[PDB]
Amino acid sequence: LITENMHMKLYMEGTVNNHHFKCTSEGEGKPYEGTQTMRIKVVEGGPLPFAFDILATSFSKTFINHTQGIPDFFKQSFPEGFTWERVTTYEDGGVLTATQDTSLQDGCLIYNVKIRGVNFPSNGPVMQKKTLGWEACTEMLYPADGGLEGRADMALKLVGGGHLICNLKTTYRSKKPAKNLKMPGVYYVDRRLERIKEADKETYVEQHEVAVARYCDLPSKL
């Protein structure tokens, strides 16, 4: 069901600090190679009065290269699909909750996302639009009651050269019955999420991700 080349379509809506917005996107990737591109339009509420960077991780788990024979919870979940829900907490107080549904319809991946961001500081780099994209990061995934949890800290680059850190807590849930899933143990996903293009003080954005799943590649004593 998951071919070597796949397309995706996405619908996103929500609010950040009482600012309403809506996006749509389409893209393609190579799910077994862990690469993908999404071309995103802000269609309502734009240009956004906050940094688009805080929405970046809300635009795709089917496109992770699961190496070393790690069971692939995401690719296994089709045709039924899967969901994820995340709370991202910024060190200066912003909190952004994202809820997502992933389905497969007529050979295309379909994403539906709802966003609720609150308490971003009015004078901070997010609301002031003083961000410059994300550093690479490693997410740890681990089984927890029939689904997976993920944890990562990400660093947001800032105008002037500093960083603002946030913490991501995600739960990934399959729509496939447990009986039909081979669960992985604990593992890690290295990611590089990059902005390739922006047009119109950020109403059009192209993003690229490469994502590779691995175990810890250090020798063990146990």
Author numbering: 4 to 62, 66 to 228
Please share text taken word for word from the publication where this structure appeared.
Fluorescent proteins have facilitated major breakthroughs in modern molecular cell biology. They are widely used for studying biological events, such as cellular trafficking and endocytosis, and have contributed to the development of innovations such as multiphoton microscopy, genetically-encoded sensors, and super-resolution microscopy. mKate, a derivative of eqFP578 from Entacmaea quadricolor, is a bright, monomeric, far-red fluorescent protein with excitation and emission peaks at 588 nm and 635 nm, respectively. Structural characterization of mKate under different conditions revealed the pH-dependent trans-cis isomerization of its chromophore, a discovery that further aided the development of mKate variants with enhanced optical properties. Using a structure-informed approach, we introduced a minimal set of two mutations in the chromophore environment of mKate. The first mutation, S158A, has been shown to destabilize the trans conformation of the chromophore, whereas the second mutation, S143C, was intended to impact the cis conformation.
Similar to the parent protein mKate, GmKate barely fluoresces at low pH (pH 2.0–4.0). The crystal structure of the dim state (pH 4.0, determined at 2.0 Å resolution) revealed equal occupancy of the trans- and cis-conformations, suggesting that the apparent pKa of cis-trans isomerization is close to 4.0. The trans-conformation is presumably a neutral (protonated) state, since the absorbance maximum remains unchanged at 445 nm in low pH buffers. The loss of fluorescence may be attributed to the non-planar nature of the trans-conformation. For GmKate, pKaPT was determined to be 9.5±0.4, by fitting the 598 nm-absorbance pH titration profile with a first-order Hill equation. pKaTC was roughly estimated to be close to 4.0 based on the crystallographic data at pH 4.0. In the crystal structures of the double-mutant, both cis and trans conformation are present to varying degrees, suggesting that while these two residues in mKate are involved in stabilizing the cis and trans state, they are not required for the isomerization.
